[PDB]
Amino acid sequence: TGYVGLKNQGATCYMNSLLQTLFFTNQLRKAVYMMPTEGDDSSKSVPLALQRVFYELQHSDKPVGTKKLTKSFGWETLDSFMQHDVQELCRVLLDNVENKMKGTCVEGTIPKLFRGKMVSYIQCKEVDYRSDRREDYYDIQLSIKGKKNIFESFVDYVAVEQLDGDNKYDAGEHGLQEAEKGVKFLTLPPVLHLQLMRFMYDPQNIKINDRFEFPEQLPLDEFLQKTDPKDPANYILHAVLVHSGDNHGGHYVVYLNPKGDGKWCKFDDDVVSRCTKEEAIEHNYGTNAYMLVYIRESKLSEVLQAVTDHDIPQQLVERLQEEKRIEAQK
Numbered sequence: 001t002g003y004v005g006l007k008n009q010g011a012t013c014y015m016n017s018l019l020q021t022l023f024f025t026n027q028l029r030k031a032v033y034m035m036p037t038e039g040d041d042s043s044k045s046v047p048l049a050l051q052r053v054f055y056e057l058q059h060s061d062k063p064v065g066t067k068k069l070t071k072s073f074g075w076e077t078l079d080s081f082m083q084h085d086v087q088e089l090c091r092v093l094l095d096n097v098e099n100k101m102k103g104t105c106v107e108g109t110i111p112k113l114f115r116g117k118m119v120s121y122i123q124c125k126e127v128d129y130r131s132d133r134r135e136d137y138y139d140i141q142l143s144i145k146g147k148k149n150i151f152e153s154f155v156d157y158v159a160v161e162q163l164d165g166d167n168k169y170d171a172g173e174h175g176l177q178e179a180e181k182g183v184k185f186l187t188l189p190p191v192l193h194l195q196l197m198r199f200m201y202d203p204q205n206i207k208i209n210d211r212f213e214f215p216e217q218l219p220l221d222e223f224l225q226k227t228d229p230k231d232p233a234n235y236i237l238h239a240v241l242v243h244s245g246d247n248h249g250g251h252y253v254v255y256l257n258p259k260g261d262g263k264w265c266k267f268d269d270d271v272v273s274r275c276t277k278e279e280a281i282e283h284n285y286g287t288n289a290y291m292l293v294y295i296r297e298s299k300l301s302e303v304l305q306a307v308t309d310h311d312i313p314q315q316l317v318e319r320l321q322e323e324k325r326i327e328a329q330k
């Protein structure tokens, strides 16, 4: 494959999986390399740690470690990974980066890549009164219980909810009305991070293992309030984050097609291997997926830009090799 894996150094669960995904987000990798981090602390800085891991993954011929990372962002209790979830670990990661790339030539790259626009609204039935509001999203959680494929989920996500009596809406000025409450998409970011909800709550959490399908190609113009010609919302599956187990244990993996070309690889901790399209997609409908990444067709070449070794500044490169030199002593 040419690509190197991450070391299994404890119960990082999904962290490794996620990291590989961010690594193969090339415009994110480049931008991360451009962060001003010569003044930062070797073990306490998050942004420096993510540089180290990315550099290491690009150059090392030996599985890469991640202890300085987990130390940087301070998840170190016996279950701080078991009890958090991926959107969380992501946010911790991308907000430290968002904010470091600020008054920099690469400022705004995170929003550029991940931010989308929602409009959420309530609307009174009998009496006339409307409440519309814009929200920014960096990821989307989709339900699965009673859903066969992603299309159903999207149709369910934008579905209107009813606010019938006993649960009517406080129009305040206009009293208690029955109301239709819904959400609509204005825009979808270059990179779609969709999470599946396979962990529920307290009927009596439980990992749902119910069959749930998803395509290599995902068309989303129906869900946009306004399509445009000349940039449709057509999306190319890039990565499939997988887990096999229950609410007590399991094993986490990610299937990736890094160059978006449809040549897939499985990343099992320290063991990358080629694999079929079938093993990455269809074989994880339910050993099932819990998060998917899509990139917009029109954006692929700009998101998966080639990354030379010259793209790392030398001040960085010097620094890291130094840290390797010291940390080579018995």
Ligand SMILES: O=C([C@@H]1CCCC[C@H]1c1ccccc1)N1CCC(O)(Cn2cnc3ccccc3c2=O)CC1
Binding pocket: 013, 014, 081, 082, 083, 084, 085, 086, 087, 141, 195, 196, 197, 198, 199, 200, 207, 243, 246, 247, 248, 249, 250, 290
């Ligand atoms: O590793 C685990 C847990 C760790 C403890 C044991 C179960 C394990 C798990 C859970 C669901 C699927 C696969 C593995 N993960 C990673 C993936 C996810 O984070 C996906 N997600 C993400 N967001 C949600 C938001 C609302 C409702 C449900 C979910 C949900 O299931 C859940 C937790």
